[PDB]
Design a protein around this nucleic acid. Structure first.
Ligand code: MG
Length: 460
DNA sequence: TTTTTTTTTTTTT
């Protein structure tokens, strides 16, 4: 049984992993060294008739719902192809921004179509990765050997195509699958030691081994939330485990200003923390970040950021060191910072994270999954979690409408009307109109916009 | 195994 990597990319009909719908899936299996060892896997998803794609998405992809309808299968079947692949044992599933995008799409796809939302990321020696912060880490800590591209600002960029184009390699789902593989090869070759460190430290216990909460042991963290002006980097001190989020540890940015932490109380810090930057004043921002141990965060030994590297990124070493001393010498801050986080929708599509399912409920859902579509009306199952009845109804109506009775068909009509209100339909047309006037002399973009209008006429 | 819709930021469609 061989360890593989499954590189994958989704095209979608919008940015929202729960509310929007997938259009296309692309994947290829490689060996540990990133040599291709299987056929390309590309296929489309038919959108159910309770949905209209966002115009912006479709303009970027070039994939129309008509195209997807013609070329694809229903979501249930789409979910089932994606799942067989994903649950091949000893598979590491990865892409480019997948942890914060594609993996969300996957969780919701399995959630909607009765597969476990997470098991593909851990069962049977499975795992996941994401090359995005690998690229960021490399630039920040061992930039040598790779060309780092900039914007009209001078800031380093990490858009995939910007990176591949800058390194003489090369929208199209399968093309992005190759670009990701190519990017994995590049770093592996130019910086194997860092690559090894980041691969090994995906592990949460490996990460906990690095996290010393009681002593506030300083670390280097790379993250987009720091922004390209610092090359996404800073030194960090772990203060506490998040009181409500098992996968989060509360951390202080040692480069920021630690006086609002020293001075304000917990309630004022909380209020300060949740004020936007624009409607923030002459006041300092609270320099606290959550780091999520399950999301392949880049966390290394403090001294991994080399003096010259810190100097390149313009990160004040002594300032950090000063803050770390103060924080260690003011234990009460920890009490306040934790208290910040100890405070705490009718669409079932949006309620995946409401919680796990009981044991009765998972066995029942298992049976939903194993039943031929045609046989579900004959089932009559009882669930406890109120999500499931709704999950089931959407599942059946969206994927197997030939299967619904009149009551169910009436319920579905109602549902469609509640989605396609006149106010929603007005909003959709306005956007299309607005867009057709912006790209009036673009034969490609005008024809997409037009196909989107027709599709709305034809399904609503 | 997980964090949904207050903040940071940048990328994903
Ligand atoms: Mg992508």
């Amino acid at each position: 049984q061989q360890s593989t990597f499954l590189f994958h990319d989704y095209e979608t009909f919008g940015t929202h992993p729960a509310l929007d719908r997938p259009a296309q899936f692309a994947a290829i299996r490689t060996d540990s060294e990133f040599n291709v060892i299987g056929e390309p896997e590309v296929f489309y998803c038919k959108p159910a008739d309770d949905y209209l794609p966002q115009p912006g998405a479709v303009l970027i992809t070039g994939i129309t719902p008509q195209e997807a309808r013609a070329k694809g299968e229903n979501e249930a079947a789409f979910a089932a192809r994606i799942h067989s692949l994903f649950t091949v044992p000893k598979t590491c599933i990865l892409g480019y921004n997948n942890v914060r995008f594609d993996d969300e799409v996957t969780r919701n796809i399995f959630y909607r179509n009765f597969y476990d939302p997470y098991a593909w990321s851990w069962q049977h020696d499975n795992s996941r990765w994401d090359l995005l912060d690998v690229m960021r880490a490399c630039y920040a800590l061992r930039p040598e050997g790779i060309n780092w591209p900039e914007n009209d600002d001078g800031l380093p960029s990490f858009r995939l195509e910007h990176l591949t184009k800058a390194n003489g390699i090369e929208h199209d789902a399968m093309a992005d699958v190759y670009a990701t593989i190519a990017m994995a090869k590049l770093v592996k070759t130019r910086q194997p030691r860092l690559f090894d460190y980041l691969f090994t430290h995906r592990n949460k216990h490996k990460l906990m081994a690095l996290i010393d909460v009681p002593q506030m042991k300083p670390l280097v963290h790379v993250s987009g939330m720091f922004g390209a002006w610092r090359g996404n980097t800073s030194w960090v001190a772990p203060l506490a485990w998040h009181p409500e989020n098992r996968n989060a540890v509360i951390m202080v940015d040692l480069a920021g200003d630690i006086s609002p932490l020293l001075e304000l109380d917990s309630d004022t810090l909380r209020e300060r923390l949740y004020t936007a930057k624009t409607d923030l004043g002459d006041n300092a921002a609270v320099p606290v970040k959550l780091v999520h141990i399950n999301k392949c965060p880049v966390l290394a030994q403090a001294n991994t950021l080399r003096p010259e590297d810190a100097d390149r990124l313009g990160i004040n070493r002594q300032h950090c060191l000063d803050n770390l001393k103060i924080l260690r010498e003011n234990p009460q801050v920890r009490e306040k910072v934790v208290a910040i986080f100890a405070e705490a929708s009718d669409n079932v599509d949006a309620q995946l994270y409401n919680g796990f399912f009981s044991d009765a409920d998972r066995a029942a859902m298992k049976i939903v999954l194993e039943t031929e579509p045609r046989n579900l009306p004959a089932l009559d199952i009882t669930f406890v979690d109120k999500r499931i009845e709704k999950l089931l109804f959407n599942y059946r109506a969206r994927n197997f409408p030939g299967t619904l009775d009149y009551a169910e068909q009436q319920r579905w009509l109602e549902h469609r009307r509640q989605v396609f209100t006149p106010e929603f339909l007005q909003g959709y047309a306005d956007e299309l109109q607005m867009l057709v006037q912006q790209y009036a002399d673009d034969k490609e973009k005008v024809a997409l916009l037009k196909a989107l209008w027709q599709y709305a006429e034809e399904i609503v």
